[PDB]
Structures are given as structure tokens and as C-alpha cells.
Amino acid sequence: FNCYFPLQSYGFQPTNGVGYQPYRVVVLSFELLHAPATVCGPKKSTNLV
Amino acid sequence: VQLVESGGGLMQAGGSLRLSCAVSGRTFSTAAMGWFRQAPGKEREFVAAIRWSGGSAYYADSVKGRFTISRDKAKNTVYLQMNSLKYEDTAVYYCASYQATRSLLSDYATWPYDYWGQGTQVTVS
Amino acid sequence: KNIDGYFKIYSKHTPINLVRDLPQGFSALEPLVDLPIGINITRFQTLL
């Protein structure tokens, strides 16, 4: 009484509503530190003038 | 998983008995085990459940205060202590495994479980 | 200092001649390392 386990399972069946269907989630956070920027885009570099 | 029960047999009313059921394979750390029983000609009935993590126990009313369920995590074994045996307690008892985790323990009384042991007969004279 | 889960180390080496305490004066510590640990820290110790 008033003492419950904090976690609970998901019910994932093939027949479940799209709202209840499983979704895989990736969250990308972008960070500028006290450090060189080391993750860059594929944009090609050029000569310096 | 495979569930194997032991400890059934003939006992006189008023005695006490400890059941054993070893759980093996992919034993989830945040699951629970329950014991249920089916008497000849009756529906399967929940007896007691224990959560593997933390060891909190939930009992059916017919046995609460008389029976104790326990588990030894290191040994992966759950026990049903059947004290004050009565005639009506005569039945086949099955050890049952839950994979799904519930926030409300009482839900394990009604949840349909995944795997069942073979059962061991206890008969109370 | 371990800020936001990033372990920052600044340092400076200078020659000194004193057996009493910290020399009085002024000198700046340049950064050396930034470790992206995310480790919660509350205690530490020295090894000699």
C-alpha cells in the first residue's frame, strides 16, 4: 500500500494502434566546447586567398 | 525458460512445506515470479507472486498470513512456504514466470504469464 | 573543474625558491586538456 515499483512494461503487439506502436528514437545534440570543432559536414574545403 | 518444481507429496493438515522452483536462462533482473495452482476440475488460481528485484511479495487472500513466498537471487530459486496446510489446499501448484514489469504489484494477480512449470502434487489429509 | 560533464585542466609551471607557502604574485594558467567524461565527482585524492 503506497509502495510501488517505479517502472512498467510496454504492450507491443502487431495489432496495436500507431499511437501505441514502438518507435525508435535518436536525439542528436550539437555542442560547441572549449575545444576544436571536430564533427564537420561533408562540404569540401577550398584553397585560401 | 525452463521451470522445474519439486517438494510435493502427502502431508497432514496443520503441517508446513517448502516448495522449490529453479528458474534458468535469460533471467530478467526486473521481472517477478508467481505461483499458481489448479485443483482437478477447477480453474487455475493465483497463489503468490514475488518480484525478483527487491523481493516484495503479493499473496492471494486464501493464503495471506499463512504462506510465504521467497526467492534467492544468487541461486535463481523461488520458494513457496505452505504453512497450516488444509484439505482445500490440495491441488497441483505451478511455478510461473513473468517477463513484463508492472508498476502496480496487484496486477500480477491477473496478468497472463509467459511460461509455466510442470506442477508438483501436494495432498493434504 | 568538471563542468557539464567535461573535465577541464588548466595549468602553469613556474620556478620558485621558497620553503614556506604560496609565492605572492600573478601568473595565468593555460588550458591543457578537456576530457568529455560526464562523471559525477564529489571527492578526490592525490598520489605521491
In degrees, rounded to 5, the angle at the alpha carbon of residue B113 between the alpha carbons of residues B9 and B27 is: 85
The alpha carbon of C19 is separated from its chain's Cα centroid by a whole number of angstroms, namely 21
Q: Sheet holding B68-72: strands in order across?
A: B3-6, B16-23, B77-83, B68-72
Total Cβ atoms within 10 A of residue B102: 17
Interface touch A5/B100, C-beta < 8 Å: no
Beta strands (DSSP E) in chain C are 2-3, 6-11, 30-35
Residues of C in contact with A33 (CB under 8 A): 6, 34
Nearest CA in chain A to C6: A33
What is the Cα–Cα distance from B85 to B123, expressed in whole angstroms? 9
CA distances from B111 to B7, B58, B106, B107 (A): 26, 13, 9, 6
Which distant-in-sequence residues (6+ apart) come within 8 Å of A45 by Cβ?
none
Can you give the residue ranges of every domain in chain B? 2-124
> CB-based contacts of B26: which residues, under 8 Å, 6+ apart?
B1
Q: Which fold has domain B2-124?
A: Immunoglobulin-like (2.60.40)
Per-residue exposure over A32-45, b if at least 16 CB sit within 10 Å of its own CB, e if not: eeeeeeeeeeeeee
Across the beta sheet with C30-35, what order do the strands follow? C2-3, C6-11, C30-35
C-alpha span between B99 and B114 (Å, rounded): 7
| Chains with at least 3 CB pairs less than 8 angstroms from chain C | A
Tally Cβ neighbours within 10 Å of residue B22. Answer: 16
**Chain A neighbors of C8, CB-CB under 8 A:** 34
- Nearest CA to B78 among B25, B26, B4, B1? B4
Chain A closest CA to C1's CA: distance in Å?
13
Which residues in chain C touch residue A34, judged by CB atoms under 8 angstroms apart?
Answer: 6, 8, 31, 34
Nearest CA in chain A to B99: A9
Rounded to the nearest 5 degrees, what angle is found at the Cα of B98, between the Cα atoms of B96 and B101?
155
The C-alpha cell that represents B31 in the structure block? 521481472
Compute the distance between CA of residue B8 and CA of residue A47 in angstroms, rounded to an integer: 84
In terms of DSSP bridges, do strands B10-11 and B120-124 run parallel, antiparallel, or are they unpaired?
A: parallel
CA atoms within 13 A on the CB side of B2: 1
